[PDB]
Amino acid sequence: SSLSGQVAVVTGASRGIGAAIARKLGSLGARVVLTARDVEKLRAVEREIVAAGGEAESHACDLSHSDAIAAFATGVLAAHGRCDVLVNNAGVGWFGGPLHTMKPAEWDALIAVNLKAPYLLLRAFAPAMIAAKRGHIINISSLAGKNPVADGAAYTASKWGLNGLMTSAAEELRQHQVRVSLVAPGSVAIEPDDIADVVALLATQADQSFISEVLVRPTLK
Amino acid sequence: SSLSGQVAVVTGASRGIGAAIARKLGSLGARVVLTARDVEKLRAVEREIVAAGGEAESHACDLSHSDAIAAFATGVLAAHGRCDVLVNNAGVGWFGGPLHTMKPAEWDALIAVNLKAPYLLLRAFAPAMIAAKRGHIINISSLAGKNPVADGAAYTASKWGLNGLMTSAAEELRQHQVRVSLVAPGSVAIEPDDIADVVALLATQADQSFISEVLVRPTLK
Amino acid sequence: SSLSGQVAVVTGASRGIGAAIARKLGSLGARVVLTARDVEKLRAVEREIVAAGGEAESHACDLSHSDAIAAFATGVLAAHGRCDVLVNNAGVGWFGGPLHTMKPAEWDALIAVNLKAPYLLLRAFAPAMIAAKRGHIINISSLAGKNPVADGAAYTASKWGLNGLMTSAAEELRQHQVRVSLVAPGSVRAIEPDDIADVVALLATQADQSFISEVLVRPTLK
Amino acid sequence: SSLSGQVAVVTGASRGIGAAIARKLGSLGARVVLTARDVEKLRAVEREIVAAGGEAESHACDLSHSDAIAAFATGVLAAHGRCDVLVNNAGVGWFGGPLHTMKPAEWDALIAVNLKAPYLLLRAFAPAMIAAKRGHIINISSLAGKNPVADGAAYTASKWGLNGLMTSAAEELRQHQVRVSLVAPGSVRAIEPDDIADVVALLATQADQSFISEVLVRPTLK
């Protein structure tokens, strides 16, 4: 198998894109560490991966708590000694209305998960990737830094912010042979498996190859 | 005078771009409400504005505290009944090293000022601008959403995030005749007065005119 | 006023944005050299400039030919010896269908005007601006380089192309005190000709030290 | 392997990226139609493809002429009846000086190859792809649309132009199951030809449902 002997951490793995990425990496032989808030929705996906012949485990982790993320990483690295693929996929939305109508607590909840947690996760897993001189950090971004979403202002800030965050970290980590990439829409409707296929393509590149960004347009009809 | 009878709030007004924007708007007749952390550096600038014949006042405000920002806005609107120009200029930097080396508390301090405070300020002053169907919110962004800064990853995230935030809020507010604009570098070295001149140009547009973004390249030699 | 004794070239100056930019520049005291395919469409705008007490001449310039652009600039320089303000405003459209149905002759007509003419104009006037150590070249772009127009593929290319062409020339000419700028829309989704004319006014009359390189404009407030 | 019984056109296929893309596509079982100004520079690459047991033909195509591109595509279609993979890879450079010193003939040579040829090629092969309800058009772009090259102004225009041209054509052709894509650099600041060839391989062999529209590549890990 392409990813046999590897460990893959997928956030927001309970449904949709996250679930599909989990199954895909599991089918290639990676041991998939699934995380989300709801353990029960995770277990369905854990069972499917195992049923089809792969390895998977489930961990509740509240991504808005820094200590919780450090506890989660410490457990994963203590149990398996490595993380080959970190997929930043967990995301929240807020589309209630204009930015002045957004409460600070709603701002905090959205930025904590969409922007701060991918930084915390990279901070928790990158030092191990550096020491091993290998690994992928792959970020699912639902906006390409181009068009604002009226009534989704904080949301937009978090995605363009993620893009700038991870584009910068890519220049920092490449000297240690660690690869940070971005997956984003190339239009403006995408089947989860297509994004899963892109992540699989990223995680199985030749050693020297460094694809930094893939833009995907809606599945054909 | 072009801005006579108007109130202009300028954040980070104690030195450089902020100071220069303060003096410029003061010279056009605006009453300038200066804010920063250090009251003493503010007073020098307050004295210059008054010395040259304008009106100005100084207020310490810690932009990383939401309540402090609401207290500050409440005072300004209670004292003058209006805010015609809000300039988001206060900014912090962090260029210590790669993103995994950045401490969460340093992340928090940078994002609180560069990204959350401009949202809090818009939230505190926009409702008054909406009710009056007029006003400018002008954001000084030191990056145009284009090039990452290695070793300034959080910093980059905060500027691209600001851009997406304010581009979205511009679509929301325009229906109430309130105008959100962005000033940013167009290259890659800029004299503070040139940025001050751009802000003055934004604050004095024809009613109907909506310049949303100005890119500025280094002062000529 | 501000631009007294300057000459401003303005292409596609017979209506809309070009017309307004013409009127706005003349009203600030610049002599407005106007351009269009046909000299008769220009008379109306030339009249409004004079009537308000500014100077204005009219030339037929076919922007699809180099020779034509060369002869046109030669004349302007022989007559006045300077060009202070070159406004690349003329453009064509093509939205007939998908790219593969577009014929080479249509491609050529669109690219010649939208992408090649602004270069030729810059080439013909930049020497005088460089020698004089001052000048503005201002470009009106209907696309900001972000979103594609389906069934306007060549049109899209010509605009993103223009943005790249003039962003680069701007770096080349800074050293000579010549300022190249762009004006483009600020949203994907409606803009009053005067809003643009005002922005152009603003660029044409900046402080010498300052260099505004791009201005994005959103639809006029209603 | 993956591409058995397909035909892949590859322009500028005599060395570097084009050479590698050629080898990589042949090794997956596609018949590789190679292009260059001169048919002799192609023999080496054609030999490597056959030697490894793939098929490959060589044509001299002068991309600066429409007729030439038309005659070239006509031949390929008469000979095989399909083009599965069109790789727009050939390009020229010009970095002689600032835009105003660039002569119209040099402008024309650069634009004809960099911007007009990819359109002409797409126009000549898209009809067959549309009829067949499958096909890839893959474009190699050396600029991502963000940063200007001072003293490479026309070059810059041709690349940002290409990005806009092909982003638009991609929207036009989705409905017919034809997939247009871009490959470009991921940093302002050095990339192994095989990295590109691999990405092209990846695009050429996607699932039918999927549509990757752009791939950015950073310099090869050292």
Residue numbers in the entry:
A (entry chain A), B (entry chain A): 2 to 189, 206 to 238
C (entry chain D), D (entry chain D): 2 to 190, 206 to 238
Give verbatim excerpts from the published study on this entry.
Therefore we identified a novel oxidoreductase, designated BpiB09, which was able to inactivate the 3-oxo-C12-HSL signaling molecule. The novel metagenome-derived enzyme strongly affected P. aeruginosa biofilm formation and other QS-related phenotypes. Further HPLC-MS analyses of purified enzyme resulted in a turnover of 3-oxo-C12-HSL to 3-hydroxy-C12-HSL.
BpiB09 enzyme was crystallized and we solved the BpiB09 structure at a resolution of 2.4 Å together with the cofactor NADP. A Gly-motif (TGxxxGxG) at the N-terminal region delineates the binding site of the adenosine half of the dinucleotide co-factor. The active substrate binding site of BpiB09 can unambiguously be located in the variable C-terminal region by the presence of a catalytic tetrad. Crystals of BpiB09 contain four copies per asymmetric unit, which correspond to two halves of a homotetramer based on the arrangement in other homotetrameric SDRs. The dimerization interface within the asymmetric unit involves an extended beta-sheet, which aligns strand β7 of two protomers in an anti-parallel fashion (A and D monomer). During refinement of the structure residual electron density appeared at the topological switch point of BpiB09 which was modeled as a partial NADP+. The active site of BpiB09 is exposed to the solvent and the 21 residue long loop likely covers the site only after the substrate has bound, as observed in pertinent SDRs.
